[PDB]
Amino acid sequence: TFDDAGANVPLITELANDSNVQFLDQDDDDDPDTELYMTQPFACGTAFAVSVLDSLMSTSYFNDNALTLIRTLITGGATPELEQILAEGAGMRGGYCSPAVLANRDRCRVAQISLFDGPLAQFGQGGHYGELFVYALRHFGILCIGLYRFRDTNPSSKRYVITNPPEDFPLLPTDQVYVLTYK
Amino acid sequence: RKFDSTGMFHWCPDRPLNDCLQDRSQASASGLRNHVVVCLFADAASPLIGLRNLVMPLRASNFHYHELKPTIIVGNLDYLHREWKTLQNFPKLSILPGSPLNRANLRAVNINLCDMCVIVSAKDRNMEDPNLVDKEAILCSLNIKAMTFDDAGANVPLITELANDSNVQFLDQDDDDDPDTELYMTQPFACGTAFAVSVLDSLMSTSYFNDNALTLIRTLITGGATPELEQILAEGAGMRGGYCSPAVLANRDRCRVAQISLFDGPLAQFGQGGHYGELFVYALRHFGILCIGLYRFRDTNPSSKRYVITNPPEDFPLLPTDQVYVLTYK
Amino acid sequence: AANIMRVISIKNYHSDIKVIVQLLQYHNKAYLLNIPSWDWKRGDDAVCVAELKLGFIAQSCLAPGFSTLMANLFTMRSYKPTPEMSQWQTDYMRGTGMEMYTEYLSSAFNALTFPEAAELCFSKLKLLLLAIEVRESTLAINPGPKVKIENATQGFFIAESAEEVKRAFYYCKNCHANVSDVRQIKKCKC
Numbered sequence: 001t002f003d004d005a006g007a008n009v010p011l012i013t014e015l016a017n018d019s020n021v022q023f024l025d026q027d028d029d030d031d032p033d034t035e036l037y038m039t040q041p042f043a044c045g046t047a048f049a050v051s052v053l054d055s056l057m058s059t060s061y062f063n064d065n066a067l068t069l070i071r072t073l074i075t076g077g078a079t080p081e082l083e084q085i086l087a088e089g090a091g092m093r094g095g096y097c098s099p100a101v102l103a104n105r106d107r108c109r110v111a112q113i114s115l116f117d118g119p120l121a122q123f124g125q126g127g128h129y130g131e132l133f134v135y136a137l138r139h140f141g142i143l144c145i146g147l148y149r150f151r152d153t154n155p156s157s158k159r160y161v162i163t164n165p166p167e168d169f170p171l172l173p174t175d176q177v178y179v180l181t182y183k
Numbered sequence: 184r185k186f187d188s189t190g191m192f193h194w195c196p197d198r199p200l201n202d203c204l205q206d207r208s209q210a211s212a213s214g215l216r217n218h219v220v221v222c223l224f225a226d227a228a229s230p231l232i233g234l235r236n237l238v239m240p241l242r243a244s245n246f247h248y249h250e251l252k253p254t255i256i257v258g259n260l261d262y263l264h265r266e267w268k269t270l271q272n273f274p275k276l277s278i279l280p281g282s283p284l285n286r287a288n289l290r291a292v293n294i295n296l297c298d299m300c301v302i303v304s305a306k307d308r309n310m311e312d313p314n315l316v317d318k319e320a321i322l323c324s325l326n327i328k329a330m331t332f333d334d335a336g337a338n339v340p341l342i343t344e345l346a347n348d349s350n351v352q353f354l355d356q357d358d359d360d361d362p363d364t365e366l367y368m369t370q371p372f373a374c375g376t377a378f379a380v381s382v383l384d385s386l387m388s389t390s391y392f393n394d395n396a397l398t399l400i401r402t403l404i405t406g407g408a409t410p411e412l413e414q415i416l417a418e419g420a421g422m423r424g425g426y427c428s429p430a431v432l433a434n435r436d437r438c439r440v441a442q443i444s445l446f447d448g449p450l451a452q453f454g455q456g457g458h459y460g461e462l463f464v465y466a467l468r469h470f471g472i473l474c475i476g477l478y479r480f481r482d483t484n485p486s487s488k489r490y491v492i493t494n495p496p497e498d499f500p501l502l503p504t505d506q507v508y509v510l511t512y513k
Numbered sequence: 514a515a516n517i518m519r520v521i522s523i524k525n526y527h528s529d530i531k532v533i534v535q536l537l538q539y540h541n542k543a544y545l546l547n548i549p550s551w552d553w554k555r556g557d558d559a560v561c562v563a564e565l566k567l568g569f570i571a572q573s574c575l576a577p578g579f580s581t582l583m584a585n586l587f588t589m590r591s592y593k594p595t596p597e598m599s600q601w602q603t604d605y606m607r608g609t610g611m612e613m614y615t616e617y618l619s620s621a622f623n624a625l626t627f628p629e630a631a632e633l634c635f636s637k638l639k640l641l642l643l644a645i646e647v648r649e650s651t652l653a654i655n656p657g658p659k660v661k662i663e664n665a666t667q668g669f670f671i672a673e674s675a676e677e678v679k680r681a682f683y684y685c686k687n688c689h690a691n692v693s694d695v696r697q698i699k700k701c702k703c
Contacts, residue, residue: 012573012580014566037585043605045578048570055588056560060533063615064556069644069652069669070587070613074568080553087543089285108654112576133635137628143643143655145671146608148578151601160601161578163585163608164641164671178582180643180655284544318518325521326547337549353518353525356549 008157013041015049027156043160044151077107108180112148115175123171130167132177141182148176184248187272187424188415190431191407193242193251194424195274200267204260204278211291213277215253220297222283223258224319225305227265232305235269236405242273243406244435251275255292257283262305272422283323286330295332295339302343309346317350324354338487343371345379357486373490374481407437438510442478445505453501460497462507471512478506517544524550536561586613586671614670616678618645621686622662627655630662634670638680639695641671 015021018036022028024047028040041047060067071078085093115124115132119139123132129147136142147162149172159176162169185194205213219241221234234256241252253275256263260280270276281288283302294300302323310316320343328337345351348366352358354377358370371377390397401408415423445454445462449469453462459477466472477492479502489506492499520532528550536542536559551557569580576582585608592610594603622630627645634642644654646667653660670678680698685691689701 010577012570014570037588037590037609038602038606042581043602045573045581048566048573048580048584050562050566052584052588053560053562053565056565057533057535059587060558060560064558065646065652065667066587066613066615066669067558067560069654070583071568072652072654074565074572074583076568076571083542083546087546088287089543090287110572110576110579112579130636134632137632141628141655141657143631145641145643146582149601149604159578160605161581161585161608162604163582163611165604165608167636167639178576178579182655182657286547312515314518314522315514318514321521322517322544322547325549326544329547329549353521356525356528 011046013047015047018049018051021047021049040151040158044158045161046158073108073110077104106182108182111179111181113142113177113179115171115173115177120177121173124173124175127171128167129165129169129171132171133167136177136179143180144177145180146178147171148178150174185425186244186427186432187412187422188427188431189409189412190427190434191244191409191412192239192422192424193244193246193248193274194272194422197271197421200264200271200278203276204280205255207279207281207287207291210255210277210279211293215255215293216296217298218253218255218293218296220289220292220294220300221254221256221258222300222302222323223256223262223305224283224303224323225259225262227259227261229262229305229307231266232303233269234266234303235273237301237303238270238273238276239408240404240406242275243437243439244432245407245437245439248274252298253277255279257281257288257292268421272424284319284326286326289327289330290332294327294330295335297339299340299342300327302341304344304346313347314350316346317353320345321350321353328355341376343377345377348379348381351377351379370481370488374488375491376488403438403440407434436512438512441509441511443472443507443509445501445503445507450507451503454503454505457501458497459495459499459501462501463497466507466509473510474507475510476508477501478508480504514541517541520545520551521548524548529555531556533558533560535559537563539564585609586611588612592673610673611671612674614672614675614678615667616670617682618662618666618668619682619684620664621684621688622666622681623664625662626658627653627660627662628658630668631655634668634681637691638684638698640677640681642668642681643671644669 013024021036021039021041022030022032024041030039036042036049036051039047056067113120115121120132120136123135133144136144145164147165148159149162151158151160153172186192187194221237238254241254251274255277257279260278263278263280279288279292283289302320304320306319308316324341324343327339327341330336343354351366351369351371352360352362354371360369366372366379366381369377386397443450445451450462450466453465463474466474475494477495478489479492481488481490483502516534516536520534523530523532534545539561542559542561545551545559569584572583573580589612590609592607594606598606618630622633625633631642634640644652645656645662647653647660648663668681670681672678680695683698683700685701685703688703690697690699
């Protein structure tokens with residue numbers, strides 16, 4: 001508890017045993033037979049476990065390029081030049097940069113934007129995900145990939161993740177949008 | 184210039200390890216070239232391998248001081264403090280503390296300019312997995328062999344001690360040896376890039392059948408450790424030395440194993456399509472140089488590997504790229 | 514250490530085998546980067562679970578649920594509702610039915626800007642195009658109006674199955690069938 005709280009603070013926990021997710025939060029009411037990806041703490045992004053990474057072996061085989069995309073995103077841009085420069089054992093060499101390399105500072109980033117205010121709030125006010133997607137793409141180059149919506153729409157702070165909603169999927173002014181952006 | 188009290192080795196007074204410890208920088212500063220690099224894998228608590236037996240033959244009195252190869256050891260510092268009590272009397276010796284797998288250590292050391300890189304391990308010689316025992320030595324070989332340099336890589340001279348003779352199959356590429364081949368027939372052994380303690384086993388039987396033959400091999404490989412030196416070390420006071428009388432210093436002239444090239448100088452006339460018998464008789468008579476074998480490029484047409492031909496036939500042809508193992512007094 | 518010695522043995526036997534290895538530690542990747550035959554242009558790869566787990570949670574510090582967003586795309590799962598599910602669980606589980614797929618954009622996309630191709634691919638084909646392979650070649654993610662689609666461009670899509678993304682290869686525009694039902698694209702031959 002705090003003074004000028006508690007369960008409101010954002011948490012993410014790495015778990016060694018996926019089952020222990022059942023203890024991690026209250027007002028879950030999940031059946032303990034549920035697999036990790038369906039549990040409330042995983043569906044909200046409060047839990048993570050190394051087991052969900054296993055199909056990176058099979059996807060590395062079937063399409064190597066897809067493994068390089070996920071990486072460019074999650075590493076923030078660790079190129080194989082950096083992996084080689086670190087393998088030289090001298091540590092991470094750096095300093096001031098030429099404009100020619102510094103050009104790469106503009107890359108796509110995973111960002112989150114809120115429908116509560118600003119130019120997209122007109123879609124939060126009872127619009128649809130397809131209207132939002134087309135508008136944001138065209139006016140801003142902002143490519144939307146999912147929603148982060150409050151589970152308690154009526155009172156906890158939990159939110160859940162909706163990957164790639166349908167074109168006609170309704171929006172709430174409290175929604176937040178996962179986007180890919182150059183700004 | 185000083186010597187061990189028996190005249191046989193170059194010597195200097197004791198020092199603290201911190202007089203010979205360097206840093207990546209100081210080292211690079213050092214103009215190392217034609218040196219010997221020792222890549223030493225050890226834990227602080229691991230058994231003493233006795234690197235005096237590596238550094239002593241390289242510091243014999245039959246070399247002039249100007250032709251003593253500088254020596255640098257890359258390895259664990261806490262281990263080297265335990266070893267140092269035996270090393271502290273040898274000149275032109277230095278330590279760069281750290282992992283030999285760290286590429287910045289190898290570059291500071293000028294690994295590309297050395298006359299030999301030795302890969303050696305003090306780690307547990309019978310740890311759990313028979314394939315894991317040599318992983319540090321194999322990774323160190325493959326690491327150095329894959330580097331690149333600027334004003335390379337697989338060109339640098341390497342010798343690796345192996346704990347399991349079979350692991351020789353991983354040690355190099357463009358071998359194409361069948362893994363059923365015994366060590367002495369494998370490419371890395373035939374070139375002198377690999378060594379393993381198993382090849383020493385018949386020193387027990389040869390010690391029995393002709394003791395004198397065991398004293399020859401030793402006089403050569405130790406660079407001249409006489410039983411007087413073995414007794415003087417058994418007195419526990421360390422290697423006593425200083426300046427020497429001409430009467431003991433007379434022993435500075437001893438036979439040494441040397442290597443000479445048929446590319447230029449007076450013997451090149453034999454490299455130009457002569458025969459080993461012509462070379463042998465000529466060198467013996469004019470120089471007292473007794474030839475015992477050849478070191479010839481395997482790729483005669485393009486890698487730097489060479490192989491060893493012990494005692495060729497009298498009519499055996501020569502190439503101008505051959506090098507000759509010889510016994511010499513100069 | 515054991516898995517590095519395997520890749521050494523495999524590459525020593527034949528250098529040109531594509532090797533994919535799981536690593537538990539990121540610093541151990543340096544040892545296999547130093548193997549003479551290791552080459553990521555040849556498709557060799559180290560799936561480093563330390564590098565990956567900490568990257569997924571680090572992106573969650575930037576976008577809170579993104580570790581869940583993104584980890585669901587890389588495992589095959591499938592939507593199978595039950596009336597016992599809350600409404601939010603049916604939305605969530607539909608999202609878990611997504612995976613990320615690679616397919617060639619049809620020639621109908623040629624010389625569109627990437628934004629126009631993404632508008633088309635979303636609105637008409639019901640597919641979320643998010644990146645393209647630009648010709649050596651390199652991956653570009655959400656590239657701006659300055660980048661055109663070109664013939665035999667591979668695209669990266671989020672979709673419910675592999676049978677969905679085929680539609681991007683099959684799409685003809687006005688040269689054949691291009692209207693109404695997403696089941697109606699079929700194959701056209703113009």
